[PDB]
């Protein structure tokens, strides 16, 4: 079992007051608060161990390089990648998807091919493929939604053919909380020789993730949603694919040689794709975040979060005129609108009560258009949120309905 | 006046021991140690103020967005840019140069044009222009060096013509410590309608920098060399140029709208060029680093550093068989080789004495080739280094010469 009270004690922001009231942070899907263990690990690195990390000769530089490669190894074990050299350090999920779209996309997707995304993708998993389809003159195909927030899987036969190079699909929707049937979709995609990129930004913090079992070709997530620092993320790529990809961002540490007359050669992956000075501070903190999450156990986190989610959905039934978007077995987030009130206003009242929710389009405008609304409210229920915080949200919505109705 | 002892007290790494001896960190040109003020500012943000920064509705998110735009304003004042919206947040100097090469380069440099770099550029200011010259079929021209480490300015007439689109030039060499005559070269480049990008990675920490007085069109530097966190840098672009540049990295926060049928539109610069979740932790720490440096005064820093440099060059005269590379009025770094010994070995012995210097090619292989060596040693003399540390370096070289000679 899992003790939310012990976990909460690790997070100094949770003591904060907003508008004179105690903060209820229900916006972890935008970014997660960090434990002291993560904050201090990064700070301690800066205080006692800092140097440049380019296999430099002196002790601090050599120890710092080792710390960074250890974090790469820890991350590969966290997602059960076969090898640590299948992981690239990127700024976050957005940069990681761009990297795949430019390096792998530009040399595997030719005119007349198609790429398949879904209608629930965040912008990070849409724009890179739009821009790519422009460049190479290919077709962006879209798996549509059902009213309950699941993919219409019956349309897959009309979307997959011999010219399908890539399926780019979200693991968990950042709005609906839908978890997609990745294992089966990957089997189908591979039957046509298509590769699969999985956007795992909203998955890695809710339950164990195993890229060997999924058999995905690419997997991305962001450190800051995983209770870690900003400025760091992970791109997993199958070794066979990764060793064939050409470079993208160019400069020091990703070259092997530079000549003004003979041109330039590049070093092996994953280092080929990490140019300039890595975000060592962020990498250190990400290592600590993975240890912290592993110490609690993702299976215990899942169990607590599922109970909190089931409690919230049960209590929200007593809010009049509340529209919920998505399936009943959602992970992490509850997207809703309250009567005909603008989500902006609902979120402003909730913030006035000290409750932080997100409003707007959630970087998922095609998802908003499918539901024929311009915006939604969204509450995230993370491992450090409490039944009492759910109660504040329910009471808050009731008050807002009564006041503005 | 400036008190190195008071300054040193702000830097917790300087107490560290290496190999059982007290650390002499002479590798700030690779990356600088950070003061407590910088470390704690970032940590405090995570502990009390953390949220996503996308003009979100709730208080923490709104205050966090404001903090980030204040740091942008502080940075523009630090380099005397006319407007805060002329600064883009990038991962560092390397990413910033790539951004210019892809966004501005791809639409202003056509086949048969030329770009001019210098022979002392770091790889970060070479590879992006090589890759670009490939794409568009243009010519990369190179300003050669004199033996003393200065540019051969007499060759400029053979390099500049009507088809010169861009001069990309370093402000201060990371190996030679040469400071280039930027103001005059920019005047010449503008007479041909060429733009100028200045690589300022090794300049911003040594003396005041004023982009209005330089009249450069682009200017880049890295936070981590400026006593700040890793994972953050600044790209300055003249407003007139920046408002015309198309996008590069695509996703959330840099779109204005996303449609699966009508395509995608982009938001205004500078935000057009900041995709995904910004490195807020790093941005906060960079703000603190700028305040800390401003509180000491760049003119006092310059004065102390120049005296330390003049002392070191004077003392190094008593090292037998020492070859120095670069001019006498160098800033920041001393590049050298000791007799016929490999720089790798010299640096290993210095690390054995607790002295951290850099060895290798310093991401400047064409500069190494000009001097017909494969590698050099380099010591950085920063604002927190002492006459006693110079003495340890001089004694160390003497011992190494006697032992290995
Ligand atoms: C499913 C998904 N894929 C990518 C990203 C971008 O991640 P990145 O910013 O690069 O770290 C997100 C970001 N989170 C958001 C979207 S704005 C939210 O608030 O739900 C995402 O949810
Ligand atoms: C003059 C100059 N321009 C760009 C960079 C890259 O900066 P970035 O890594 O992106 O922050 C550097 C890095 N510093 C080095 C080169 S390896 C050193 O050790 O002298 C530089 O000196
Ligand atoms: Cl390099
Ligand atoms: Cl967006």
mmCIF file of C-alpha atoms in Angstrom, chain B residues 82-214:
data_model
loop_
_atom_site.group_PDB
_atom_site.id
_atom_site.type_symbol
_atom_site.label_atom_id
_atom_site.label_comp_id
_atom_site.label_asym_id
_atom_site.label_seq_id
_atom_site.Cartn_x
_atom_site.Cartn_y
_atom_site.Cartn_z
ATOM 1 C CA UNK B 82 16.326 47.710 -27.955
ATOM 2 C CA UNK B 83 13.387 45.428 -27.072
ATOM 3 C CA UNK B 84 12.823 42.299 -25.002
ATOM 4 C CA UNK B 85 10.997 40.726 -27.942
ATOM 5 C CA UNK B 86 14.296 40.601 -29.832
ATOM 6 C CA UNK B 87 15.472 37.733 -27.566
ATOM 7 C CA UNK B 88 14.675 34.046 -28.095
ATOM 8 C CA UNK B 89 15.244 31.384 -25.422
ATOM 9 C CA UNK B 90 17.267 28.486 -26.890
ATOM 10 C CA UNK B 91 19.029 25.495 -25.313
ATOM 11 C CA UNK B 92 22.402 27.183 -25.854
ATOM 12 C CA UNK B 93 24.729 28.783 -28.367
ATOM 13 C CA UNK B 94 24.756 25.639 -30.543
ATOM 14 C CA UNK B 95 20.986 25.427 -30.871
ATOM 15 C CA UNK B 96 20.758 29.175 -31.437
ATOM 16 C CA UNK B 97 23.145 29.111 -34.406
ATOM 17 C CA UNK B 98 21.263 26.151 -35.916
ATOM 18 C CA UNK B 99 17.998 28.081 -35.521
ATOM 19 C CA UNK B 100 19.359 31.011 -37.530
ATOM 20 C CA UNK B 101 20.874 28.683 -40.115
ATOM 21 C CA UNK B 102 17.566 26.874 -40.699
ATOM 22 C CA UNK B 103 14.969 29.617 -40.299
ATOM 23 C CA UNK B 104 16.822 32.628 -41.692
ATOM 24 C CA UNK B 105 19.420 30.779 -43.759
ATOM 25 C CA UNK B 106 17.028 28.587 -45.735
ATOM 26 C CA UNK B 107 15.134 31.603 -47.093
ATOM 27 C CA UNK B 108 17.899 34.176 -47.553
ATOM 28 C CA UNK B 109 20.823 32.143 -48.907
ATOM 29 C CA UNK B 110 20.386 30.911 -52.483
ATOM 30 C CA UNK B 111 22.568 28.894 -54.833
ATOM 31 C CA UNK B 112 25.635 30.848 -55.885
ATOM 32 C CA UNK B 113 25.643 33.000 -52.754
ATOM 33 C CA UNK B 114 28.455 32.805 -50.196
ATOM 34 C CA UNK B 115 28.777 32.775 -46.394
ATOM 35 C CA UNK B 116 31.964 33.875 -44.605
ATOM 36 C CA UNK B 117 33.214 32.320 -41.359
ATOM 37 C CA UNK B 118 36.673 32.514 -39.783
ATOM 38 C CA UNK B 119 39.305 29.859 -39.219
ATOM 39 C CA UNK B 120 39.086 30.265 -35.423
ATOM 40 C CA UNK B 121 35.371 29.420 -35.164
ATOM 41 C CA UNK B 122 34.197 26.684 -32.852
ATOM 42 C CA UNK B 123 32.338 23.784 -34.460
ATOM 43 C CA UNK B 124 29.028 25.313 -33.344
ATOM 44 C CA UNK B 125 29.716 28.187 -35.768
ATOM 45 C CA UNK B 126 30.964 25.966 -38.616
ATOM 46 C CA UNK B 127 28.801 22.871 -39.053
ATOM 47 C CA UNK B 128 25.452 24.729 -39.327
ATOM 48 C CA UNK B 129 26.835 26.763 -42.226
ATOM 49 C CA UNK B 130 28.399 23.723 -43.878
ATOM 50 C CA UNK B 131 25.077 21.870 -43.679
ATOM 51 C CA UNK B 132 23.282 24.968 -44.984
ATOM 52 C CA UNK B 133 25.715 25.491 -47.881
ATOM 53 C CA UNK B 134 25.045 21.864 -48.841
ATOM 54 C CA UNK B 135 21.230 22.288 -48.834
ATOM 55 C CA UNK B 136 21.108 25.504 -50.890
ATOM 56 C CA UNK B 137 24.322 24.990 -52.906
ATOM 57 C CA UNK B 138 26.288 28.020 -51.679
ATOM 58 C CA UNK B 139 29.972 28.568 -50.902
ATOM 59 C CA UNK B 140 31.496 28.664 -47.389
ATOM 60 C CA UNK B 141 34.394 31.153 -47.410
ATOM 61 C CA UNK B 142 36.924 31.341 -44.560
ATOM 62 C CA UNK B 143 38.918 34.252 -43.109
ATOM 63 C CA UNK B 144 42.383 32.784 -42.363
ATOM 64 C CA UNK B 145 44.584 33.363 -39.309
ATOM 65 C CA UNK B 146 47.926 35.014 -38.687
ATOM 66 C CA UNK B 147 50.516 33.144 -36.589
ATOM 67 C CA UNK B 148 49.704 35.325 -33.583
ATOM 68 C CA UNK B 149 46.067 34.180 -33.559
ATOM 69 C CA UNK B 150 44.473 37.237 -35.170
ATOM 70 C CA UNK B 151 42.393 37.271 -38.336
ATOM 71 C CA UNK B 152 44.123 38.198 -41.604
ATOM 72 C CA UNK B 153 41.880 41.171 -42.235
ATOM 73 C CA UNK B 154 43.723 41.981 -45.488
ATOM 74 C CA UNK B 155 41.897 39.076 -47.139
ATOM 75 C CA UNK B 156 38.430 40.547 -46.580
ATOM 76 C CA UNK B 157 38.273 42.137 -50.100
ATOM 77 C CA UNK B 158 38.708 38.735 -51.739
ATOM 78 C CA UNK B 159 35.942 37.238 -49.571
ATOM 79 C CA UNK B 160 33.211 39.902 -49.586
ATOM 80 C CA UNK B 161 31.239 40.539 -52.772
ATOM 81 C CA UNK B 162 27.643 41.236 -53.833
ATOM 82 C CA UNK B 163 26.617 37.598 -53.267
ATOM 83 C CA UNK B 164 27.811 37.550 -49.614
ATOM 84 C CA UNK B 165 24.689 36.959 -47.532
ATOM 85 C CA UNK B 166 26.167 36.420 -44.075
ATOM 86 C CA UNK B 167 29.292 36.827 -41.965
ATOM 87 C CA UNK B 168 29.322 34.429 -38.989
ATOM 88 C CA UNK B 169 32.140 35.424 -36.660
ATOM 89 C CA UNK B 170 33.224 34.761 -33.100
ATOM 90 C CA UNK B 171 33.368 37.617 -30.620
ATOM 91 C CA UNK B 172 36.117 35.958 -28.527
ATOM 92 C CA UNK B 173 37.966 32.755 -29.486
ATOM 93 C CA UNK B 174 37.492 29.899 -27.019
ATOM 94 C CA UNK B 175 41.116 28.814 -27.647
ATOM 95 C CA UNK B 176 43.202 31.858 -28.513
ATOM 96 C CA UNK B 177 41.352 34.437 -26.412
ATOM 97 C CA UNK B 178 41.508 36.771 -29.417
ATOM 98 C CA UNK B 179 38.806 39.433 -29.419
ATOM 99 C CA UNK B 180 37.810 40.285 -32.958
ATOM 100 C CA UNK B 181 37.163 43.810 -34.298
ATOM 101 C CA UNK B 182 33.431 43.226 -34.579
ATOM 102 C CA UNK B 183 32.278 46.822 -34.979
ATOM 103 C CA UNK B 184 34.407 47.411 -38.080
ATOM 104 C CA UNK B 185 33.773 44.019 -39.658
ATOM 105 C CA UNK B 186 30.031 44.590 -39.242
ATOM 106 C CA UNK B 187 30.302 47.969 -40.980
ATOM 107 C CA UNK B 188 32.062 46.255 -43.905
ATOM 108 C CA UNK B 189 29.566 43.414 -44.048
ATOM 109 C CA UNK B 190 26.629 45.791 -44.063
ATOM 110 C CA UNK B 191 28.128 47.746 -46.968
ATOM 111 C CA UNK B 192 27.419 44.628 -49.059
ATOM 112 C CA UNK B 193 24.001 43.928 -47.562
ATOM 113 C CA UNK B 194 25.339 40.934 -45.675
ATOM 114 C CA UNK B 195 23.982 40.145 -42.236
ATOM 115 C CA UNK B 196 26.296 39.368 -39.299
ATOM 116 C CA UNK B 197 25.815 36.664 -36.680
ATOM 117 C CA UNK B 198 28.161 37.037 -33.700
ATOM 118 C CA UNK B 199 29.023 33.977 -31.625
ATOM 119 C CA UNK B 200 29.304 35.569 -28.190
ATOM 120 C CA UNK B 201 29.690 32.393 -26.122
ATOM 121 C CA UNK B 202 33.075 33.503 -24.739
ATOM 122 C CA UNK B 203 32.339 37.244 -24.523
ATOM 123 C CA UNK B 204 29.348 37.921 -22.281
ATOM 124 C CA UNK B 205 31.161 37.016 -19.032
ATOM 125 C CA UNK B 206 34.319 39.097 -19.559
ATOM 126 C CA UNK B 207 33.088 42.653 -20.244
ATOM 127 C CA UNK B 208 29.918 44.597 -21.126
ATOM 128 C CA UNK B 209 28.371 43.749 -24.481
ATOM 129 C CA UNK B 210 26.090 46.142 -26.363
ATOM 130 C CA UNK B 211 24.369 44.840 -29.488
ATOM 131 C CA UNK B 212 23.082 48.267 -30.477
ATOM 132 C CA UNK B 213 26.651 49.603 -30.564
ATOM 133 C CA UNK B 214 27.919 46.510 -32.396
#
